[PDB]
Design a protein around this ligand. Structure first.
Ligand SMILES: [Cl-]
Ligand SMILES: [Cl-]
Ligand SMILES: [Cl-]
Ligand SMILES: [Cl-]
Ligand SMILES: [Cl-]
Ligand SMILES: [Cl-]
Ligand SMILES: [Mg+2]
Ligand SMILES: [Mg+2]
Ligand SMILES: [Mg+2]
Ligand SMILES: [Mg+2]
Ligand SMILES: [Mg+2]
Ligand SMILES: [Mg+2]
Lengths: 234, 10, 234, 10
């Protein structure tokens, strides 16, 4: 890897600089290099890893949706040749490559070394997320297997989070939020999505009284996203 | 589309 | 080049798709491929080329300024090692590479084949612009030569535009706008910047009566930028 | 900073 010669601490320092500069492709390459040093990641470092790749894949997802929309209109009317499909495929392939890279880092060897609930749930949620992003563009004979891989990762993360974390924990909340999005947008299960969002919100509400002002702010921020989705979905 | 989680979680 | 096997028309089509998707690095690579087919560019194609590279270098300039600011603070107080300088240099080198690529396309062979005022002035303005972007980050023994290259290109474009184009022509106006920015920001000549902006604005004002509603809108949009600068500068 | 020209010019 091109980052093999750089110190771990320097990679982390430069990841933070790249974030400030909104250079998320650089940020992701720096954090990939940091992961490949082989040491476990701290809470802050896990968040840097997620911020970097979420922004990279976020740009690819937005582009893919634009191109896919154009492609579907073309098939309603004038023929224009293969270019729209070709370029949609180009972006799609790049997106799939980023997802495969993240999933590879989780499998080699972030997840197997993660023993604390906060790290293990964070990484398993990430695994579900990037299989979900793959599912968003999947159309062939492995769409079903991609969907079940996302579901399986989310479910393992959910089981741990319910046993080991309070209902207001932001990682637990963000996991439940994203699993509910998986149900609604990927798995054709809107009722499951709604039920999960409502129970997650209500169980967090009842635990807010235990929190400091700062933790209350962290938790209510994610709870509002659950509420926004319920308003969209009902 | 639905809202998903921010990347950074405490 | 990686685009050598793709049809010119397909490259243009995909450049327009990339613009819609806000994939400006792709857009620039497609338009570079189109230029390298060796045919002259139409007005629309010249604008696609400029849109693509302006957005690419615009992201690099914004990142460079963030990192340069951090670097200058570090030199006011705790030592943190070479990382800030290294990463600023990385972005700076990538920025310089993009500028060199654009200048290479203009020199091989866009400018020498451009005979009409609209194309020749557009390309000479671009040459001035990308030498100006190089000047923004230049600090060594060639800063003076980079600045004079920008000045020389802008001046040739100005001479042609005053002889061959009406004062409201958007290319002429955008050229004068950018030459005035060169004077203010690069050449330490605020009075020259102000004088050029005012005379450009006033000569355009007096020619607006000749224009259709749509051309009036095109011209007044650029005139407002001249006015915004004069308000900042005085 | 000063405003410069848009990329697309008619
Ligand atoms: Cl980026
Ligand atoms: Cl393509
Ligand atoms: Cl799993
Ligand atoms: Cl881009
Ligand atoms: Cl670097
Ligand atoms: Cl010149
Ligand atoms: Mg070391
Ligand atoms: Mg027809
Ligand atoms: Mg929060
Ligand atoms: Mg051909
Ligand atoms: Mg000190
Ligand atoms: Mg205009």
């Amino acid at each position: 890897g091109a980052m093999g010669s750089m110190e771990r601490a320097s990679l982390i320092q430069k990841a933070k600089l790249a974030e400030q500069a909104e250079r998320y492709e650089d940020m992701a390459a720096f954090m990939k290099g940091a992961v490949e040093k082989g040491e476990e990641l701290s809470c802050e470092e896990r968040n840097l890893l997620s911020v970097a790749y979420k922004n990279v894949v976020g740009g690819q997802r937005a582009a893919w949706r634009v191109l896919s929309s154009i492609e579907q209109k073309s098939n309603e009317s004038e023929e224009k040749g293969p270019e729209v499909r070709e370029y949609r495929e180009k972006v799609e392939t790049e997106l799939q490559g980023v997802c495969d890279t993240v999933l590879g880092l989780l499998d080699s060897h972030l997840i197997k070394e993660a023993g604390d609930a906060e790290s293990r749930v964070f990484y398993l949620k990430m695994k579900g997320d990037y299989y979900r992003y793959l599912a968003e563009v999947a159309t062939g004979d492995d769409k079903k297997r991609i969907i079940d891989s996302a579901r399986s990762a989310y479910q393992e993360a959910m089981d741990i989070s319910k046993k080991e974390m309070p209902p207001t924990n932001p990682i637990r909340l963000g996991l439940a939020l994203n699993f509910s999005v998986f149900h609604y947008e990927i798995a054709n299960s809107p009722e499951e999505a709604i039920s999960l969002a409502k129970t997650t919100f209500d169980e967090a509400m009842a635990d807010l009284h235990t929190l400091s002002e700062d933790s209350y702010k962290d938790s209510t921020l994610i709870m509002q996203l659950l509420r926004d989705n319920l308003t969209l979905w009902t | 589309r639905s809202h998903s989680s921010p990347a950074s979680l405490q």
